[PDB]
């Protein structure tokens with residue numbers, strides 16, 4: 029209850045920039061906006077986009093239900109885009125629609141893994157100093173080429189750092205800096221903290237940042253970001269079951285084995301909240317009554333808007349190696365359901381567990397079940413939807 | 420037939436460095452060595468490792484069958500490790516075991532995506548200039564902190580570049596540079612090209628490099644590298660079949676649909692060479708005679724040493740929705756085979772295609788088959804081995 033007061037954010041969102049490149053069919057900028065919106069004390073988030081993209085952005089705001097977002101037109105350069113964002117926040121006009129912050133954050137649309145910690149640190153350092161920025165060590169040596177493309181000099185790696193986002197400023201300082209800024213610097217400047225230093229004699233505080241702060245620039249960064257996203261949504265599973273005592277027991281049985289086999293995963297069970305993996309468990313039918321309920325409940329929801337939701341429909345059934353033909357015929361309705369719910373961003377898979385078995389055989393099947401489920405969750409791959417797997 | 424003559428390479432292999440971190444259970448350094456060994460004209464590859472790791476490295480050389488590798492002891496710093504590598508190549512002693520190169524390449528063990536192109540360019544520039552290095556543009560602004568951790572100054576992004584590997588030198592130049600180098604510079608220097616400039620007045624040629632040249636430093640770089648590796652081994656598939664005319668036709672049928680559905684994939688068919696994906700096709704039995712032959716042929720091979728090999732055993736069978744119980748019982752031997760060959764780094768999956776069907780139903784099953792196969796290839800995930808999938 030001690031959150032910074034009067035804070036807003038500005039994102040310039042103007043190889044080619046990757047802010048609209050999809051990850052799991054969702055544009056990268058949407059993940060960044062989500063990460064910023066989760067920080068309750070950032071009152072307004074001002075995003076600069078170009079005219080050609082203004083409609084894509086608005087559609088993105090609607091589709092993913094982003095809150096506290098005000099759009100402004102980007103300039104041709106990054107400093108111009110940021111200035112327009114600050115203008116919109118200045119509350120110094122008849123036209124102004126937004127409270128003037130004390131502290132403003134600058135972030136980039138292609139840096140989706142920002143969290144409340146580093147933000148708090150840069151906001152706090154900026155109150156005390158006027159300006160602040162996240163830094164990282166250099167991995168590569170920096171060099172200066174001559175006109176003919178030969179080594180002129182090398183810089184001492186230990187005396188330099190890479191400037192990263194987020195940055196934060198006392199609003200009046202940075203706004204005043206932009207108002208004094210030469211048009212040359214607006215065109216060719218890359219670094220807001222250098223503006224504050226040159227035009228307001230404000231020496232920014234450099235805060236140490238995590239490896240997560242990097243900017244998505246290349247294809248390989250998109251790969252890395254996809255993986256981090258998929259890992260983070262793999263850490264929670266909800267096992268769902270009927271009130272029937274048979275179903276509750278196998279459901280809880282599976283819950284327990286998922287907990288013990290998948291270390292560092294939060295597993296819960298609900299009868300029949302930011303969870304994207306569901307394990308629906310059934311003994312008492314050769315059908316999908318429980319799974320159908322769960323799907324209809326998710327087809328409505330906005331869980332499916334934000335990330336692909338994985339649903340594993342699990343059936344405990346009596347059989348030696350293969351279940352009887354007629355029961356297997358019923359289970360194959362999974363294919364049809366999977367095809368339908370794929371359209372709503374749900375990935376539906378089936379898993380058969382032989383029940384009952386001898387103790388050790390059943391233990392092994394439960395472990396295999398857990399591994400299979402973890403695998404389907406990890407990969408989140410649409411290619412295997414509708415399959416009936418066996419533990 | 421115009422390859423550079425008298426070339427050798429030196430790799431200093433001494434968060435914590437990631438050269439022994441596994442990707443697909445194979446250490447990162449092994450992928451780099453493979454990439455360098457593929458360049459035929461690099462006569463010797465000298466790798467510096469620390470004493471504690473000398474045995475791991477030797478084991479790695481044996482396990483993955485690396486050629487042309489000579490090991491030397493790493494120093495405590497990077498310049499010391501490189502000097503020892505050059506010493507071993509100098510051929511200026513009774514103890515010398517290696518031809519003296521005209522040009523030597525320096526590379527890093529944690530940069531596995533180096534290819535003949537950039538190598539040729541830096542070797543060629545180094546003949547003409549004495550020294551040469553790959554460069555990249557800067558993504559982040561570089562700054563200098565003051566003692567109290569505040570912004571001192573920012574560097575102009577457009578006048579600087581990030582120095583990357585590979586680098587190459589006329590041997591005598593760089594060897595002479597190391598022989599004149601102060602112990603301070605051996606301790607604190609990060610940049611071989613700066614050595615050549617300071618101690619031999621050699622201005623290195625800066626060659627433009629690809630985004631692939633980056634160094635694996637963080638967990639997120641390991642993710643990216645894994646993805647790139649898996650993508651590159653996904654571009655070739657071998658469909659394997661009996662001489663039986665029935666099997667040849669369904670095998671070739673599937674080959675053709677894989678070609679058309681998987682654009683930019685090289686697909687070939689062999690009867691029953693750097694391919695890690697096999698599709699074994701069978702109509703004429705409810706058994707795995709053809710697949711067993713293929714597995715035994717791979718259990719011997721060194722394909723499985725370098726990358727996990729994916730094998731999809733495909734059965735075309737008559738059935739409406741579910742195949743008859745007794746035939747399904749036979750197909751479940753797949754589970755047992757998969758468990759066994761997993762130990763030899765082979766990932767075995769099963770796929771059932773209903774045959775015959777009406778034209779359009781069969782077309783659809785073939786397409787789904789292709790998507791399933793592509794998915795299993797893409798992910799290369801051990802969790803789903805032994806499953807019988809249905810197209």
Ligand SMILES: [Cl-]
Pocket residue numbers: 103108111112
């Ligand atoms: Cl402006």
Ligand SMILES: [Cl-]
Pocket residue numbers: 494499502503
């Ligand atoms: Cl030495």
Ligand SMILES: [Mg+2]
Pocket residue numbers: 105106107108213214215216217218
């Ligand atoms: Mg600018």
Ligand SMILES: [Mg+2]
Pocket residue numbers: 496497498499604605606607608609
């Ligand atoms: Mg050194």
